[PDB]
Amino acid sequence: GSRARVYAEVNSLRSREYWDYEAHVPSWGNQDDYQLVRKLGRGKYSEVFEAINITNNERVVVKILKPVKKKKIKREVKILENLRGGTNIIKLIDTVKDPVSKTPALVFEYINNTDFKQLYQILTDFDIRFYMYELLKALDYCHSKGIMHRDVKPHNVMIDHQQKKLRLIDWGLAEFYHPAQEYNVRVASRYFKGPELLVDYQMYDYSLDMWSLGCMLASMIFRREPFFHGQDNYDQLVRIAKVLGTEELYGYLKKYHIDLDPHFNDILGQHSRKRWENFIHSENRHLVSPEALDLLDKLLRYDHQQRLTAKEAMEHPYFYPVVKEQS
Ligand SMILES: CCC(=O)Nc1cc(Nc2cc(NC3CC3)n3ncc(C#N)c3n2)ccc1C
């Protein structure tokens, strides 16, 4: 058994219509109002374009949803409607369909993002604190709304470094949290998967997103991106254990009665827990402080119940300079 430490019952306490996305009936506008300009990328079930709304000249991002269970489309639309106005959550502007083919598309606000591979190289200590604080506001918001993002990674955090705007994007893997529900562990990018996913523990919660955020924090302050760079899902756990330690892993497995896939016997080895200070060197020293290491140590923990919540993390002394600056 496992339950979220916060927000556990928040969907139960709301109208069923709030979380019963299969019953949701979107209002589908007309895609002919949008002119595609440039392809920006694609997902497994999506293609993404920069576009212009020709009725008002607004620049937008259009996500055209290829074949996919209409249930997954309803889920993403309902989650985005529930998160409307949330702090640092990408704004859904419109839901539209090709009026002939009825192919659906989602229209989002445009963010002039700096590619994270270039950005992370130039961030100052204060920059990291600021952006992580802003990202935490997005996670606290969605968690308070009963939603797990489940795909937190640099590619899904758009940062306009000139205007200092941050948005958490791509809610296509997000899901409603319900206590005791068993969820599919095939979520998140390999490098950002929490240990619970890697050991096939299905009773996870919002704290999965906090592992992913911790991975991002580590990559920023230490300038090793991704921080845990597995070659596959098995090696991903080995990379984690070489830092957190194997004895600590086994304690986690025992607490939650977790059966470890026996292919791990050949590859985990034995590893002491490493001090976070071992990652400091001349290239990253200016980004690391006792406060950063204390926060990171409280995010990158095997035991999902022991990780800080997004609110607890925001309240950590590491962010005091950000809070002070904003007043
Ligand atoms: C709707 C986009 C999504 O859910 N995923 C996604 C985004 C993307 N690239 C993007 C890229 C940008 N701006 C970059 C070009 C300057 N922006 N700005 C806002 C949004 C949004 N939303 C955005 N998505 C590339 C591939 C995929 C799969």
Side-chain angles (χ1 to χ4, degrees), residues 1-3 180-186 194-205 207-208 252-253 255-259 302-305:
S2 180
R3 166 181 294 242
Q181 183 151 325
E182 290 191 336
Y183 293 96
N184 195 312
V185 300
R186 301 177 64 92
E196 57 269 49
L197 309 181
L198 301 168
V199 303
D200 298 301
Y201 188 70
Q202 297 185 97
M203 279 190 57
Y204 64 81
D205 61 64
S207 58
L208 165 62
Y252 172 57
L253 300 178
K255 176 176 174 182
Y256 293 97
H257 304 348
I258 297 174
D259 295 323
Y302 288 118
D303 189 337
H304 52 278
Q305 282 182 16

PDB file of all heavy atoms in Angstrom, residues 1-3 180-186 194-205 207-208 252-253 255-259 302-305:
ATOM      1  N   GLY A   1       0.807  -1.206   0.000  1.00  0.00           N
ATOM      2  CA  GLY A   1       0.000   0.000   0.000  1.00  0.00           C
ATOM      3  C   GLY A   1       0.843   1.260   0.000  1.00  0.00           C
ATOM      4  O   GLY A   1       1.909   1.326   0.623  1.00  0.00           O
ATOM      5  N   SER A   2       0.361   2.267  -0.719  1.00  0.00           N
ATOM      6  CA  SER A   2       1.019   3.560  -0.795  1.00  0.00           C
ATOM      7  C   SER A   2      -0.006   4.601  -1.221  1.00  0.00           C
ATOM      8  O   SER A   2      -0.828   4.351  -2.110  1.00  0.00           O
ATOM      9  CB  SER A   2       2.188   3.560  -1.799  1.00  0.00           C
ATOM     10  OG  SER A   2       2.814   4.829  -1.843  1.00  0.00           O
ATOM     11  N   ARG A   3       0.075   5.771  -0.600  1.00  0.00           N
ATOM     12  CA  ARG A   3      -0.810   6.887  -0.882  1.00  0.00           C
ATOM     13  C   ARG A   3       0.024   8.158  -0.907  1.00  0.00           C
ATOM     14  O   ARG A   3       1.025   8.270  -0.200  1.00  0.00           O
ATOM     15  CB  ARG A   3      -1.881   6.988   0.218  1.00  0.00           C
ATOM     16  CG  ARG A   3      -2.649   8.283   0.241  1.00  0.00           C
ATOM     17  CD  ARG A   3      -3.658   8.280   1.377  1.00  0.00           C
ATOM     18  NE  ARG A   3      -4.698   7.283   1.159  1.00  0.00           N
ATOM     19  CZ  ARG A   3      -5.990   7.549   1.017  1.00  0.00           C
ATOM     20  NH1 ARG A   3      -6.466   8.780   1.144  1.00  0.00           N
ATOM     21  NH2 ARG A   3      -6.829   6.552   0.750  1.00  0.00           N
ATOM     22  N   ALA A 180      -4.651   4.586  -4.338  1.00  0.00           N
ATOM     23  CA  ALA A 180      -4.572   3.135  -4.482  1.00  0.00           C
ATOM     24  C   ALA A 180      -4.657   2.690  -5.932  1.00  0.00           C
ATOM     25  O   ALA A 180      -4.561   1.486  -6.186  1.00  0.00           O
ATOM     26  CB  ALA A 180      -5.608   2.364  -3.653  1.00  0.00           C
ATOM     27  N   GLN A 181      -4.821   3.602  -6.887  1.00  0.00           N
ATOM     28  CA  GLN A 181      -4.901   3.199  -8.280  1.00  0.00           C
ATOM     29  C   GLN A 181      -3.541   2.709  -8.749  1.00  0.00           C
ATOM     30  O   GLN A 181      -2.498   3.249  -8.369  1.00  0.00           O
ATOM     31  CB  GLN A 181      -5.378   4.375  -9.143  1.00  0.00           C
ATOM     32  CG  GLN A 181      -5.578   4.054 -10.619  1.00  0.00           C
ATOM     33  CD  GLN A 181      -6.654   4.918 -11.271  1.00  0.00           C
ATOM     34  OE1 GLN A 181      -7.651   5.266 -10.641  1.00  0.00           O
ATOM     35  NE2 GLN A 181      -6.463   5.248 -12.546  1.00  0.00           N
ATOM     36  N   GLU A 182      -3.558   1.661  -9.564  1.00  0.00           N
ATOM     37  CA  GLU A 182      -2.344   1.136 -10.171  1.00  0.00           C
ATOM     38  C   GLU A 182      -2.190   1.756 -11.556  1.00  0.00           C
ATOM     39  O   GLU A 182      -3.081   1.620 -12.402  1.00  0.00           O
ATOM     40  CB  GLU A 182      -2.416  -0.391 -10.234  1.00  0.00           C
ATOM     41  CG  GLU A 182      -2.315  -1.040  -8.844  1.00  0.00           C
ATOM     42  CD  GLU A 182      -2.115  -2.559  -8.872  1.00  0.00           C
ATOM     43  OE1 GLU A 182      -2.494  -3.206  -9.878  1.00  0.00           O
ATOM     44  OE2 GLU A 182      -1.580  -3.107  -7.876  1.00  0.00           O
ATOM     45  N   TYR A 183      -1.072   2.440 -11.780  1.00  0.00           N
ATOM     46  CA  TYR A 183      -0.834   3.191 -13.005  1.00  0.00           C
ATOM     47  C   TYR A 183       0.206   2.490 -13.857  1.00  0.00           C
ATOM     48  O   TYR A 183       1.009   1.693 -13.364  1.00  0.00           O
ATOM     49  CB  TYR A 183      -0.360   4.622 -12.700  1.00  0.00           C
ATOM     50  CG  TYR A 183      -1.439   5.457 -12.037  1.00  0.00           C
ATOM     51  CD1 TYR A 183      -1.493   5.601 -10.662  1.00  0.00           C
ATOM     52  CD2 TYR A 183      -2.416   6.083 -12.798  1.00  0.00           C
ATOM     53  CE1 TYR A 183      -2.482   6.341 -10.068  1.00  0.00           C
ATOM     54  CE2 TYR A 183      -3.416   6.823 -12.215  1.00  0.00           C
ATOM     55  CZ  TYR A 183      -3.449   6.956 -10.850  1.00  0.00           C
ATOM     56  OH  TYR A 183      -4.470   7.680 -10.258  1.00  0.00           O
ATOM     57  N   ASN A 184       0.159   2.784 -15.153  1.00  0.00           N
ATOM     58  CA  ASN A 184       1.122   2.228 -16.081  1.00  0.00           C
ATOM     59  C   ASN A 184       2.484   2.839 -15.814  1.00  0.00           C
ATOM     60  O   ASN A 184       2.617   4.066 -15.719  1.00  0.00           O
ATOM     61  CB  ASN A 184       0.683   2.541 -17.500  1.00  0.00           C
ATOM     62  CG  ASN A 184       1.403   1.703 -18.528  1.00  0.00           C
ATOM     63  OD1 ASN A 184       2.624   1.570 -18.496  1.00  0.00           O
ATOM     64  ND2 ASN A 184       0.645   1.115 -19.434  1.00  0.00           N
ATOM     65  N   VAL A 185       3.515   1.991 -15.693  1.00  0.00           N
ATOM     66  CA  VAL A 185       4.848   2.523 -15.398  1.00  0.00           C
ATOM     67  C   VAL A 185       5.585   2.977 -16.643  1.00  0.00           C
ATOM     68  O   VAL A 185       6.690   3.528 -16.531  1.00  0.00           O
ATOM     69  CB  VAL A 185       5.723   1.562 -14.562  1.00  0.00           C
ATOM     70  CG1 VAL A 185       5.061   1.277 -13.230  1.00  0.00           C
ATOM     71  CG2 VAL A 185       6.002   0.279 -15.309  1.00  0.00           C
ATOM     72  N   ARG A 186       5.007   2.781 -17.826  1.00  0.00           N
ATOM     73  CA  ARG A 186       5.652   3.186 -19.077  1.00  0.00           C
ATOM     74  C   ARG A 186       5.300   4.646 -19.372  1.00  0.00           C
ATOM     75  O   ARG A 186       4.574   4.982 -20.313  1.00  0.00           O
ATOM     76  CB  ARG A 186       5.252   2.249 -20.211  1.00  0.00           C
ATOM     77  CG  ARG A 186       5.626   0.793 -19.939  1.00  0.00           C
ATOM     78  CD  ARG A 186       5.157  -0.147 -21.038  1.00  0.00           C
ATOM     79  NE  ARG A 186       5.816   0.129 -22.309  1.00  0.00           N
ATOM     80  CZ  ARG A 186       6.935  -0.451 -22.725  1.00  0.00           C
ATOM     81  NH1 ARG A 186       7.564  -1.355 -21.989  1.00  0.00           N
ATOM     82  NH2 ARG A 186       7.436  -0.114 -23.912  1.00  0.00           N
ATOM     83  N   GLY A 194      11.443   7.836 -12.333  1.00  0.00           N
ATOM     84  CA  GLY A 194      11.721   7.546 -10.950  1.00  0.00           C
ATOM     85  C   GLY A 194      11.997   6.067 -10.740  1.00  0.00           C
ATOM     86  O   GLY A 194      11.554   5.209 -11.521  1.00  0.00           O
ATOM     87  N   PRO A 195      12.733   5.724  -9.672  1.00  0.00           N
ATOM     88  CA  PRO A 195      12.963   4.295  -9.392  1.00  0.00           C
ATOM     89  C   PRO A 195      11.695   3.468  -9.303  1.00  0.00           C
ATOM     90  O   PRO A 195      11.705   2.286  -9.682  1.00  0.00           O
ATOM     91  CB  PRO A 195      13.766   4.292  -8.085  1.00  0.00           C
ATOM     92  CG  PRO A 195      13.758   5.661  -7.591  1.00  0.00           C
ATOM     93  CD  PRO A 195      13.360   6.598  -8.676  1.00  0.00           C
ATOM     94  N   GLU A 196      10.596   4.051  -8.834  1.00  0.00           N
ATOM     95  CA  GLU A 196       9.351   3.305  -8.758  1.00  0.00           C
ATOM     96  C   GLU A 196       8.950   2.767 -10.128  1.00  0.00           C
ATOM     97  O   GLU A 196       8.521   1.608 -10.250  1.00  0.00           O
ATOM     98  CB  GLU A 196       8.242   4.170  -8.139  1.00  0.00           C
ATOM     99  CG  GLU A 196       7.908   5.509  -8.820  1.00  0.00           C
ATOM    100  CD  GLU A 196       8.703   6.714  -8.287  1.00  0.00           C
ATOM    101  OE1 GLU A 196       9.955   6.611  -8.187  1.00  0.00           O
ATOM    102  OE2 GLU A 196       8.092   7.792  -8.014  1.00  0.00           O
ATOM    103  N   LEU A 197       9.105   3.582 -11.179  1.00  0.00           N
ATOM    104  CA  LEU A 197       8.810   3.082 -12.518  1.00  0.00           C
ATOM    105  C   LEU A 197       9.786   1.987 -12.941  1.00  0.00           C
ATOM    106  O   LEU A 197       9.397   1.007 -13.587  1.00  0.00           O
ATOM    107  CB  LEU A 197       8.873   4.224 -13.526  1.00  0.00           C
ATOM    108  CG  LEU A 197       8.085   5.485 -13.209  1.00  0.00           C
ATOM    109  CD1 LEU A 197       8.254   6.495 -14.359  1.00  0.00           C
ATOM    110  CD2 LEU A 197       6.623   5.170 -12.952  1.00  0.00           C
ATOM    111  N   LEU A 198      11.058   2.144 -12.599  1.00  0.00           N
ATOM    112  CA  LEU A 198      12.072   1.214 -13.062  1.00  0.00           C
ATOM    113  C   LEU A 198      11.968  -0.144 -12.380  1.00  0.00           C
ATOM    114  O   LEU A 198      12.467  -1.140 -12.925  1.00  0.00           O
ATOM    115  CB  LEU A 198      13.449   1.824 -12.841  1.00  0.00           C
ATOM    116  CG  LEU A 198      13.676   3.154 -13.563  1.00  0.00           C
ATOM    117  CD1 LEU A 198      14.939   3.835 -13.076  1.00  0.00           C
ATOM    118  CD2 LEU A 198      13.710   2.944 -15.072  1.00  0.00           C
ATOM    119  N   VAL A 199      11.366  -0.204 -11.195  1.00  0.00           N
ATOM    120  CA  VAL A 199      11.118  -1.464 -10.501  1.00  0.00           C
ATOM    121  C   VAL A 199       9.675  -1.927 -10.648  1.00  0.00           C
ATOM    122  O   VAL A 199       9.266  -2.859  -9.962  1.00  0.00           O
ATOM    123  CB  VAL A 199      11.540  -1.395  -9.026  1.00  0.00           C
ATOM    124  CG1 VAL A 199      12.998  -1.021  -8.942  1.00  0.00           C
ATOM    125  CG2 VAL A 199      10.681  -0.416  -8.265  1.00  0.00           C
ATOM    126  N   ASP A 200       8.884  -1.267 -11.503  1.00  0.00           N
ATOM    127  CA  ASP A 200       7.535  -1.719 -11.851  1.00  0.00           C
ATOM    128  C   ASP A 200       6.561  -1.578 -10.679  1.00  0.00           C
ATOM    129  O   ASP A 200       5.664  -2.409 -10.488  1.00  0.00           O
ATOM    130  CB  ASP A 200       7.536  -3.150 -12.396  1.00  0.00           C
ATOM    131  CG  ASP A 200       8.338  -3.283 -13.674  1.00  0.00           C
ATOM    132  OD1 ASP A 200       8.002  -2.589 -14.653  1.00  0.00           O
ATOM    133  OD2 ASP A 200       9.312  -4.068 -13.693  1.00  0.00           O
ATOM    134  N   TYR A 201       6.732  -0.526  -9.887  1.00  0.00           N
ATOM    135  CA  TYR A 201       5.800  -0.241  -8.804  1.00  0.00           C
ATOM    136  C   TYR A 201       4.699   0.686  -9.317  1.00  0.00           C
ATOM    137  O   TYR A 201       4.950   1.870  -9.597  1.00  0.00           O
ATOM    138  CB  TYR A 201       6.527   0.377  -7.618  1.00  0.00           C
ATOM    139  CG  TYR A 201       5.639   0.515  -6.415  1.00  0.00           C
ATOM    140  CD1 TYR A 201       5.220  -0.601  -5.699  1.00  0.00           C
ATOM    141  CD2 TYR A 201       5.212   1.762  -5.984  1.00  0.00           C
ATOM    142  CE1 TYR A 201       4.385  -0.475  -4.603  1.00  0.00           C
ATOM    143  CE2 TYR A 201       4.380   1.889  -4.881  1.00  0.00           C
ATOM    144  CZ  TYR A 201       3.978   0.764  -4.191  1.00  0.00           C
ATOM    145  OH  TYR A 201       3.149   0.863  -3.081  1.00  0.00           O
ATOM    146  N   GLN A 202       3.465   0.164  -9.376  1.00  0.00           N
ATOM    147  CA  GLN A 202       2.367   0.845 -10.056  1.00  0.00           C
ATOM    148  C   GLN A 202       1.594   1.820  -9.179  1.00  0.00           C
ATOM    149  O   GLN A 202       0.886   2.670  -9.729  1.00  0.00           O
ATOM    150  CB  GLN A 202       1.391  -0.169 -10.644  1.00  0.00           C
ATOM    151  CG  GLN A 202       1.998  -1.049 -11.713  1.00  0.00           C
ATOM    152  CD  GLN A 202       0.988  -1.958 -12.357  1.00  0.00           C
ATOM    153  OE1 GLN A 202       0.453  -1.660 -13.423  1.00  0.00           O
ATOM    154  NE2 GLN A 202       0.709  -3.061 -11.714  1.00  0.00           N
ATOM    155  N   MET A 203       1.754   1.766  -7.858  1.00  0.00           N
ATOM    156  CA  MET A 203       0.999   2.630  -6.951  1.00  0.00           C
ATOM    157  C   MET A 203       1.758   3.924  -6.657  1.00  0.00           C
ATOM    158  O   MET A 203       1.947   4.323  -5.502  1.00  0.00           O
ATOM    159  CB  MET A 203       0.649   1.884  -5.669  1.00  0.00           C
ATOM    160  CG  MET A 203      -0.556   0.979  -5.777  1.00  0.00           C
ATOM    161  SD  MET A 203      -1.074   0.376  -4.157  1.00  0.00           S
ATOM    162  CE  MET A 203      -1.344   1.870  -3.292  1.00  0.00           C
ATOM    163  N   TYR A 204       2.200   4.583  -7.713  1.00  0.00           N
ATOM    164  CA  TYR A 204       2.946   5.827  -7.597  1.00  0.00           C
ATOM    165  C   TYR A 204       1.994   7.020  -7.584  1.00  0.00           C
ATOM    166  O   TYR A 204       0.765   6.870  -7.645  1.00  0.00           O
ATOM    167  CB  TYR A 204       4.016   5.900  -8.681  1.00  0.00           C
ATOM    168  CG  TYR A 204       3.512   5.946 -10.114  1.00  0.00           C
ATOM    169  CD1 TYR A 204       3.075   7.138 -10.671  1.00  0.00           C
ATOM    170  CD2 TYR A 204       3.524   4.807 -10.925  1.00  0.00           C
ATOM    171  CE1 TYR A 204       2.648   7.206 -11.989  1.00  0.00           C
ATOM    172  CE2 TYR A 204       3.108   4.875 -12.272  1.00  0.00           C
ATOM    173  CZ  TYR A 204       2.665   6.085 -12.781  1.00  0.00           C
ATOM    174  OH  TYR A 204       2.246   6.222 -14.082  1.00  0.00           O
ATOM    175  N   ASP A 205       2.554   8.213  -7.414  1.00  0.00           N
ATOM    176  CA  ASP A 205       1.729   9.410  -7.221  1.00  0.00           C
ATOM    177  C   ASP A 205       2.491  10.635  -7.739  1.00  0.00           C
ATOM    178  O   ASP A 205       3.464  10.518  -8.496  1.00  0.00           O
ATOM    179  CB  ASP A 205       1.259   9.503  -5.752  1.00  0.00           C
ATOM    180  CG  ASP A 205       2.411   9.621  -4.754  1.00  0.00           C
ATOM    181  OD1 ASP A 205       3.152  10.610  -4.769  1.00  0.00           O
ATOM    182  OD2 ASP A 205       2.569   8.703  -3.933  1.00  0.00           O
ATOM    183  N   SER A 207       4.633  12.382  -6.498  1.00  0.00           N
ATOM    184  CA  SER A 207       6.045  12.383  -6.147  1.00  0.00           C
ATOM    185  C   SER A 207       6.919  11.892  -7.285  1.00  0.00           C
ATOM    186  O   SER A 207       8.135  12.160  -7.274  1.00  0.00           O
ATOM    187  CB  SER A 207       6.262  11.574  -4.869  1.00  0.00           C
ATOM    188  OG  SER A 207       5.799  10.242  -5.031  1.00  0.00           O
ATOM    189  N   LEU A 208       6.331  11.202  -8.278  1.00  0.00           N
ATOM    190  CA  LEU A 208       7.098  10.834  -9.468  1.00  0.00           C
ATOM    191  C   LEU A 208       7.659  12.071 -10.154  1.00  0.00           C
ATOM    192  O   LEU A 208       8.835  12.100 -10.587  1.00  0.00           O
ATOM    193  CB  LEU A 208       6.199  10.061 -10.434  1.00  0.00           C
ATOM    194  CG  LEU A 208       6.720   9.912 -11.858  1.00  0.00           C
ATOM    195  CD1 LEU A 208       8.039   9.117 -11.837  1.00  0.00           C
ATOM    196  CD2 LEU A 208       5.702   9.281 -12.786  1.00  0.00           C
ATOM    197  N   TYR A 252      14.277   0.343   0.327  1.00  0.00           N
ATOM    198  CA  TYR A 252      13.077   0.802  -0.353  1.00  0.00           C
ATOM    199  C   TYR A 252      12.245  -0.378  -0.847  1.00  0.00           C
ATOM    200  O   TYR A 252      11.035  -0.435  -0.623  1.00  0.00           O
ATOM    201  CB  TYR A 252      13.509   1.695  -1.510  1.00  0.00           C
ATOM    202  CG  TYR A 252      12.430   2.124  -2.441  1.00  0.00           C
ATOM    203  CD1 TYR A 252      11.322   2.799  -1.967  1.00  0.00           C
ATOM    204  CD2 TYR A 252      12.533   1.907  -3.809  1.00  0.00           C
ATOM    205  CE1 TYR A 252      10.332   3.238  -2.832  1.00  0.00           C
ATOM    206  CE2 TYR A 252      11.544   2.356  -4.679  1.00  0.00           C
ATOM    207  CZ  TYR A 252      10.443   3.010  -4.171  1.00  0.00           C
ATOM    208  OH  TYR A 252       9.448   3.474  -5.010  1.00  0.00           O
ATOM    209  N   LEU A 253      12.872  -1.322  -1.549  1.00  0.00           N
ATOM    210  CA  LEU A 253      12.114  -2.459  -2.065  1.00  0.00           C
ATOM    211  C   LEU A 253      11.422  -3.212  -0.939  1.00  0.00           C
ATOM    212  O   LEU A 253      10.251  -3.603  -1.056  1.00  0.00           O
ATOM    213  CB  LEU A 253      13.045  -3.391  -2.833  1.00  0.00           C
ATOM    214  CG  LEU A 253      13.748  -2.768  -4.029  1.00  0.00           C
ATOM    215  CD1 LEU A 253      14.667  -3.771  -4.672  1.00  0.00           C
ATOM    216  CD2 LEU A 253      12.750  -2.231  -5.056  1.00  0.00           C
ATOM    217  N   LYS A 255      10.452  -2.092   2.025  1.00  0.00           N
ATOM    218  CA  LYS A 255       9.377  -1.335   2.658  1.00  0.00           C
ATOM    219  C   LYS A 255       8.072  -1.497   1.894  1.00  0.00           C
ATOM    220  O   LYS A 255       6.994  -1.590   2.497  1.00  0.00           O
ATOM    221  CB  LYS A 255       9.751   0.148   2.750  1.00  0.00           C
ATOM    222  CG  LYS A 255       8.649   1.037   3.306  1.00  0.00           C
ATOM    223  CD  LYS A 255       9.104   2.487   3.465  1.00  0.00           C
ATOM    224  CE  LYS A 255       7.942   3.390   3.893  1.00  0.00           C
ATOM    225  NZ  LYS A 255       8.333   4.831   4.010  1.00  0.00           N
ATOM    226  N   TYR A 256       8.145  -1.517   0.569  1.00  0.00           N
ATOM    227  CA  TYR A 256       6.955  -1.529  -0.269  1.00  0.00           C
ATOM    228  C   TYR A 256       6.683  -2.896  -0.869  1.00  0.00           C
ATOM    229  O   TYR A 256       5.810  -3.020  -1.733  1.00  0.00           O
ATOM    230  CB  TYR A 256       7.057  -0.450  -1.353  1.00  0.00           C
ATOM    231  CG  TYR A 256       7.032   0.956  -0.776  1.00  0.00           C
ATOM    232  CD1 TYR A 256       8.212   1.660  -0.538  1.00  0.00           C
ATOM    233  CD2 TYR A 256       5.832   1.566  -0.453  1.00  0.00           C
ATOM    234  CE1 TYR A 256       8.189   2.934  -0.004  1.00  0.00           C
ATOM    235  CE2 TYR A 256       5.798   2.842   0.083  1.00  0.00           C
ATOM    236  CZ  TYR A 256       6.971   3.510   0.316  1.00  0.00           C
ATOM    237  OH  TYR A 256       6.917   4.769   0.846  1.00  0.00           O
ATOM    238  N   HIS A 257       7.392  -3.925  -0.413  1.00  0.00           N
ATOM    239  CA  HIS A 257       7.149  -5.305  -0.845  1.00  0.00           C
ATOM    240  C   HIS A 257       7.323  -5.447  -2.359  1.00  0.00           C
ATOM    241  O   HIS A 257       6.521  -6.094  -3.038  1.00  0.00           O
ATOM    242  CB  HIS A 257       5.770  -5.800  -0.397  1.00  0.00           C
ATOM    243  CG  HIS A 257       5.541  -5.705   1.081  1.00  0.00           C
ATOM    244  ND1 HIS A 257       6.555  -5.443   1.978  1.00  0.00           N
ATOM    245  CD2 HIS A 257       4.414  -5.839   1.818  1.00  0.00           C
ATOM    246  CE1 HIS A 257       6.062  -5.414   3.202  1.00  0.00           C
ATOM    247  NE2 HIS A 257       4.765  -5.652   3.132  1.00  0.00           N
ATOM    248  N   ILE A 258       8.387  -4.844  -2.888  1.00  0.00           N
ATOM    249  CA  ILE A 258       8.608  -4.741  -4.330  1.00  0.00           C
ATOM    250  C   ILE A 258       9.511  -5.868  -4.791  1.00  0.00           C
ATOM    251  O   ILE A 258      10.612  -6.059  -4.259  1.00  0.00           O
ATOM    252  CB  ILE A 258       9.207  -3.383  -4.728  1.00  0.00           C
ATOM    253  CG1 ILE A 258       8.238  -2.254  -4.392  1.00  0.00           C
ATOM    254  CG2 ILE A 258       9.486  -3.376  -6.217  1.00  0.00           C
ATOM    255  CD1 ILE A 258       8.792  -0.884  -4.609  1.00  0.00           C
ATOM    256  N   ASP A 259       9.057  -6.591  -5.806  1.00  0.00           N
ATOM    257  CA  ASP A 259       9.835  -7.664  -6.402  1.00  0.00           C
ATOM    258  C   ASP A 259      10.706  -7.092  -7.503  1.00  0.00           C
ATOM    259  O   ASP A 259      10.209  -6.440  -8.427  1.00  0.00           O
ATOM    260  CB  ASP A 259       8.919  -8.732  -6.998  1.00  0.00           C
ATOM    261  CG  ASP A 259       8.090  -9.440  -5.954  1.00  0.00           C
ATOM    262  OD1 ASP A 259       8.609  -9.690  -4.832  1.00  0.00           O
ATOM    263  OD2 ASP A 259       6.917  -9.745  -6.269  1.00  0.00           O
ATOM    264  N   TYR A 302      15.028   7.273  -3.089  1.00  0.00           N
ATOM    265  CA  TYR A 302      14.289   6.136  -3.608  1.00  0.00           C
ATOM    266  C   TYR A 302      12.848   6.174  -3.140  1.00  0.00           C
ATOM    267  O   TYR A 302      11.910   6.011  -3.940  1.00  0.00           O
ATOM    268  CB  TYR A 302      14.926   4.849  -3.123  1.00  0.00           C
ATOM    269  CG  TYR A 302      16.243   4.479  -3.742  1.00  0.00           C
ATOM    270  CD1 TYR A 302      17.386   4.383  -2.964  1.00  0.00           C
ATOM    271  CD2 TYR A 302      16.338   4.137  -5.086  1.00  0.00           C
ATOM    272  CE1 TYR A 302      18.588   4.009  -3.512  1.00  0.00           C
ATOM    273  CE2 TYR A 302      17.555   3.751  -5.642  1.00  0.00           C
ATOM    274  CZ  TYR A 302      18.669   3.686  -4.850  1.00  0.00           C
ATOM    275  OH  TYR A 302      19.875   3.283  -5.392  1.00  0.00           O
ATOM    276  N   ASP A 303      12.651   6.421  -1.847  1.00  0.00           N
ATOM    277  CA  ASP A 303      11.326   6.310  -1.235  1.00  0.00           C
ATOM    278  C   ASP A 303      10.477   7.502  -1.654  1.00  0.00           C
ATOM    279  O   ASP A 303      10.680   8.630  -1.182  1.00  0.00           O
ATOM    280  CB  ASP A 303      11.455   6.230   0.279  1.00  0.00           C
ATOM    281  CG  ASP A 303      10.138   5.885   0.964  1.00  0.00           C
ATOM    282  OD1 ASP A 303       9.065   6.115   0.372  1.00  0.00           O
ATOM    283  OD2 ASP A 303      10.169   5.385   2.097  1.00  0.00           O
ATOM    284  N   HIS A 304       9.524   7.246  -2.554  1.00  0.00           N
ATOM    285  CA  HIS A 304       8.720   8.327  -3.117  1.00  0.00           C
ATOM    286  C   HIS A 304       7.967   9.100  -2.034  1.00  0.00           C
ATOM    287  O   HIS A 304       7.764  10.317  -2.178  1.00  0.00           O
ATOM    288  CB  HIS A 304       7.763   7.768  -4.176  1.00  0.00           C
ATOM    289  CG  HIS A 304       6.938   6.618  -3.695  1.00  0.00           C
ATOM    290  ND1 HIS A 304       7.414   5.325  -3.651  1.00  0.00           N
ATOM    291  CD2 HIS A 304       5.667   6.568  -3.231  1.00  0.00           C
ATOM    292  CE1 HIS A 304       6.470   4.529  -3.180  1.00  0.00           C
ATOM    293  NE2 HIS A 304       5.400   5.259  -2.917  1.00  0.00           N
ATOM    294  N   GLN A 305       7.595   8.430  -0.933  1.00  0.00           N
ATOM    295  CA  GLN A 305       6.883   9.093   0.159  1.00  0.00           C
ATOM    296  C   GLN A 305       7.769  10.046   0.943  1.00  0.00           C
ATOM    297  O   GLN A 305       7.244  10.931   1.626  1.00  0.00           O
ATOM    298  CB  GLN A 305       6.280   8.065   1.119  1.00  0.00           C
ATOM    299  CG  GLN A 305       5.031   7.440   0.589  1.00  0.00           C
ATOM    300  CD  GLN A 305       4.386   6.435   1.557  1.00  0.00           C
ATOM    301  OE1 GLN A 305       4.684   6.386   2.770  1.00  0.00           O
ATOM    302  NE2 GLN A 305       3.486   5.629   1.017  1.00  0.00           N
TER     303      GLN A 305
END
